[PDB]
Amino acid sequence: TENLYFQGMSDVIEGRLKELGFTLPNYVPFTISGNLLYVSGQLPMESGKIAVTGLVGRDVDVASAQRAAELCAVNILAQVKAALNGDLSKIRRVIKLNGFVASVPEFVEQHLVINGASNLIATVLGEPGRHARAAVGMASLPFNASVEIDAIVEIDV
Amino acid sequence: TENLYFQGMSDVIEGRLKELGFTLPVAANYVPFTISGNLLYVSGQLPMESGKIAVTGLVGRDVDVASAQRAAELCAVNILAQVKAALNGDLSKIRRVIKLNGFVASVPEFVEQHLVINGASNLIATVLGEPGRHARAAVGMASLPFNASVEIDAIVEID
Amino acid sequence: GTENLYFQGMSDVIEGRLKELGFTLPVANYVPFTISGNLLYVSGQLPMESGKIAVTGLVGRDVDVASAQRAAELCAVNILAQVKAALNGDLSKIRRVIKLNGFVASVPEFVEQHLVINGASNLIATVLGEPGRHARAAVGMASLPFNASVEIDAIVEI
Fold first, then answer.
1. Integer angstrom CA distances of residue B145 from B68, C5, C119
2. Among B88, B119, B77, which residue's Cα sits nearest to residue B10?
3. Among the CATH numbers 3.30.420.140, 1.10.418.10, 3.30.1330.40, 3.40.50.150, which is that of B1-159?
4. Nearest CA in chain C to B109
5. Which of B61, B97, B130, B136 to mutate to test the interface with C (most CBs of C within 10 A)?
6. Which residues of chain C have a CB within 8 Å of the CB of A141?
7. CA distance A1 to chain C (A)
8. Which residues of A are less than 8 Å from C114 in CB distance?
């Protein structure tokens, strides 16, 4: 019964993500300590490729970087689902996102870029999706990703 | 009585901050802080003073170390304002400042980000005493939201 | 009793494995670490060797990947020294390295910060084994204190 409830809750979360246009795809993607889930920096992977590359303010505009952040967030959710054995309803609260945005020094709208991730997360999870955050401008990122985002998530354990 | 003691402890914290030259300010799908167990995660704070970003541009180009240190202090005061909010008015319910991440907008020749973040660290340790002493990272960023010179987030263990 | 000997043994093994990789452990209002519950937060460590910053400048300009990888190893060695201090001499009391944040001083064309931080990740996993496997971020910085090429912080369950 209550496992059907949690299955249902997970279905609703993943369905809301599909309504936004996304399906879920020596260091590890995540670790757990107590009831905190540490997710490694995720890149904007889509179909096994970095979807958005280069510097925001040079190679990529805010709208494209927002999609990058959305993809990072989708990849975070993918890892959380795997961490929780298929059940995104075992998320109690997204505690923190760290949003790293590859930026030229004149680009100062990293907060708008990371809004791509924050809005998607809050939209699919509701109130438990609302999180603390940092949004910062980086010189560059692995594989020339435009955005990398890590997460700390409080989970039902 | 315990409540009076805690109000007193908070008055002392905020009074120390005034002696340093600062009053606490009053200051979406992201929030200024979250709490998990007895850990308070405070979002990255910018050098806000009177609702304005007080120090902007790149350290080593637009701003020098002294100005950047003031920026770090302001970030720290904004952190303290969020913690006060989180603890319903009571900065005495801080058990330990666990970590600050100090992000300093830097030209690549600028390599004194530790000195910049010392602005925040010194202010926090002064106002809070031993419980203010924290782990830290200090790093140079290409740029920051609103062209802030410094942004600083925090994790604080609370009562 | 011998439970204490057992932990002493495990720490010997960890430090010995580190020496096999060619490193020994080295010996303010901010501190090198704090503890909350069973979580140890270690401050950003620089590539310190014999009291000096061993590797300086921007990866892709002043230093190549192999040199940066050695910086990242030194950062990890310094993380382990702090952890050893935090645990009163006992690296065996590490339960899990939860997270490393790897900050690499980078020119904007340099995009192999994952390979740089692999220096630290591989060393940590080697000397600690399974408990050394950690979550991670690897990012490119404009510059770092003292012109370090790499700075790394850590959260460790103890």
1. 15, 52, 31
2. B88
3. 3.30.1330.40
4. C143
5. B136
6. 111, 113, 139-140
7. 34
8. 142-143
